[PDB]
Amino acid sequence: VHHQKLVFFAGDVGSNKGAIIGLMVGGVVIA
Amino acid sequence: VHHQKLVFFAGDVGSNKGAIIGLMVGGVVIA
Amino acid sequence: VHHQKLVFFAGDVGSNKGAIIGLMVGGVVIA
Amino acid sequence: VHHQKLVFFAGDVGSNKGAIIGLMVGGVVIA
Amino acid sequence: VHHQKLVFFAGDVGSNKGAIIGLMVGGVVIA
Amino acid sequence: VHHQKLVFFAGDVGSNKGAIIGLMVGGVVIA
């Protein structure tokens, strides 16, 4: 079992107002 | 079992107001 | 079981007003 | 020339991620 | 020339991540 | 020329992460 670089941004990101998540299994996220 | 670079952005991203997720298995995400 | 670099930003990030999360299993996040 | 209540929200608004504008005549808005 | 209450919110607003603007004539707004 | 209450919030506002502007004529706003 090997995970790596699940979400990757090679460039500039201007702004995040929402959610960014690698691995998600439970809980709650309201962005 | 090998995961890698599931979601990849080679350019500039201007803005995220929603969700970006690599692997998703459970839980809840409201963006 | 090996996790690494789940969410990766190779460039400049201007601003975060939301959530950024590597691994998520439980709890609650309101951004 | 009388203007009033051009945009009206009688209930609860959960979130705005775009533009809300009463009167618009010039300029530029991205949201 | 009478303006009044151009944008009106009678309920609770949860969050603004964009623009809210009453009268707009010039300039530039990103949000 | 009479302006009044251009943007009005009768309820509780949870959070502002963007712009809120009454009258706008020039300049630049990022938020």
Residue numbers in the entry:
A (entry chain A), B (entry chain A), C (entry chain A), D (entry chain B), E (entry chain B), F (entry chain B): 12 to 42
Direct quotes from the study:
The Arctic mutation, encoding E693G in the amyloid precursor protein (APP) gene [E22G in amyloid-β (Aβ)], causes dominantly inherited Alzheimer’s disease. Comparison of local conformations in this region revealed the presence of additional hydrogen bonds between adjacent Aβ molecules in mutant protofilaments; these hydrogen bonds cannot form in wild-type protofilaments, providing a plausible explanation for the increased fibrillogenesis of E22G Aβ. Mutation E22G may have an additional fibrillation-promoting effect, which is the relief of electrostatic repulsion as a result of removal of the negatively charged carboxylic group of E22; in the wild-type structure, E22 is trapped in close proximity to the carboxylic group of D23.
Solved to 2.8 Å resolution, their structures suggest that they are made of mutant protein, but the presence of some wild-type Aβ42 cannot be excluded. Only a minority of filaments is made of mutant Aβ42. Apart from a lack of side chain density at G22, their structure is identical to type II Aβ42 filaments made of wild-type protein. In these dimeric filaments, the terminal carboxyl group of A42 contributes to the protofilament interface.
